[PDB]
């Protein structure tokens, strides 16, 4: 039984700057760090505590002091961003997510709302789609309103990655209702709350308008 405590879980960094991940092991043993690029098989980075693995840039350096282990990455290349797990014997740690975040000027979203197509309604369901498009930074809040009734649970956000061209995020929340529920209420609104907007922008459409 090994109790591996890994921190800090989430890391948002721009390419270049240093990224320090760390674990804390109960028992004493040889510890390794693994890299999982998203969509690939994990990669052995460090083993035996700080011994760099085979074909790993000198930019990866592990340090150990007592029960605390670090993993220090410097000059974050494009391919380094992923998730890193520390291992001691057969046990791993919670892990940490190393996300790339290109810093830039705070833009704003282009909220667009799409009612459910008449074909979808004929099929029996209805799916309304709000679209916060090309904004920065990531953190944004979409609140679905229906007849001035706050909706939590029905929505389902989904965000794209850092747009390599302009370093901006896009988002599309999909609220789903049954045709019965859809045909019951009227004004369907999507409230956005990003810091780029001075105040929440409430793009909405009244059912049966154009």
């Amino acid at each position: 039984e090994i109790v591996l405590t890994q921190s800090p879980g989430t890391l948002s960094l721009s390419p270049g700057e240093t990224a320090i991940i760390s674990c804390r092991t109960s028992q004493y043993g040889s510890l390794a760090w693994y890299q999982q690029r998203p969509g690939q098989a994990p990669r052995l980075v460090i083993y035996s505590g700080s011994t760099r693995a085979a074909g790993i840039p000198d930019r990866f350096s592990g340090s150990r002091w007592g029960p605390d282990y670090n993993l220090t990455i410097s000059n974050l290349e494009s391919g380094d961003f992923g998730v890193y797990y520390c291992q001691q014997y057969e046990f791993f740690g919670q892990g940490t997510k190393v996300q790339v975040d290109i810093k830039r000027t705070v833009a704003a979203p282009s909220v667009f709302i799409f009612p459910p197509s008449d074909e979808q309604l004929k099929s029996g369901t209805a799916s309304v789609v709000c679209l916060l498009n090309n904004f920065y930074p990531r953190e944004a809040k979409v609140q679905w309103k229906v007849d001035n009734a706050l909706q939590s649970g029905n929505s389902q956000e989904s965000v794209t990655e850092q747009d390599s061209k302009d370093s901006t995020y896009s988002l599309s929340s999909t609220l789903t209702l049954s045709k019965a529920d859809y045909e019951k209420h009227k004004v369907y609104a999507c409230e956005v709350t990003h810091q780029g907007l001075s105040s929440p922008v409430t793009k909405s459409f009244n059912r049966g308008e154009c």
Binding site: A53, Q88, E90, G95, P116, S127, S158, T174
Partner: protein, 217 residues
């Protein structure tokens, strides 16, 4: 060299049993312990057990005792994993891994390609493509690839000509066990009047290819 080739991804349903393989090429098969590790979505790697091919001694993790069974075939240098009585909580990617040195097993330098196993009570369905009409600066429109299983689907616009301002969001797992996907694009409004736009969807797991014309309401 240290080459570990695994079988392809399988789709199972709650209750079924699965068997996946892993052929080891590039080293003395029996001289190294061979482990099975599974990565689940958002759960830390879980070690399932190891197997020493010289003698076939298995060591299964205490949680999985009863469900898991690890065999081997020295004639063909193939290690087999069998997991019985599956659950929705077994959706994961399974790996056979080998240590750097055969004197210490827990320095996994060599990993298999990975074999994903989806355990949902939801047979395959082809998507339904619905149009996200612009409805009237710049205007935007898109497609909604809804109620499809399993991942993935490919969305292209105008057969690949239009690619500026396109966003193919990640799919979402709906409460019904099927996935939903939105792919949108931003265009000049005047062009929207004269220019025409199509989204082409290909759901290879079910041989469902669709081309939806997105027209203003």
């Amino acid at each position: 060299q240290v080459q570990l080739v695994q079988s392809g991804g399988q789709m199972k349903k709650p209750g079924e049993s699965m068997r996946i393989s892993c052929r080891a090429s590039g080293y003395e098969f029996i001289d190294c312990t061979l482990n099975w590790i599974r990565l689940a979505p958002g759960k830390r790697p879980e070690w399932m057990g190891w197997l020493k091919p010289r003698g076939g001694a298995v060591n299964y993790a205490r949680p999985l005792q009863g469900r898991v069974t690890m065999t081997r075939d020295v004639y063909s240098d193939t290690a087999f994993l069998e997991l019985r009585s599956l659950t929705v909580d077994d959706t994961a990617v399974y790996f056979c891994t080998r240590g750097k040195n055969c004197d210490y097993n827990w320095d996994f330098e060599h990993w298999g390609r990975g074999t994903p196993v989806i355990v949902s009570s939801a047979s395959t369905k082809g998507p339904s493509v619905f149009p996200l009409a612009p409805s009237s600066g710049t205007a935007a429109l898109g497609c909604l690839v809804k109620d499809y299983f399993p991942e993935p689907v490919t969305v292209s616009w105008n057969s690949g000509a239009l690619t500026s301002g396109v966003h193919t969001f990640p799919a979402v797992l709906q409460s019904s066990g099927l996935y939903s996907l939105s792919s949108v694009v931003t265009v000049p409004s005047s062009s929207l009047g004269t220019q025409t736009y199509i989204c082409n969807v290909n759901h290879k797991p079910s041989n469902t290819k669709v081309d939806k014309r997105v027209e203003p309401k």
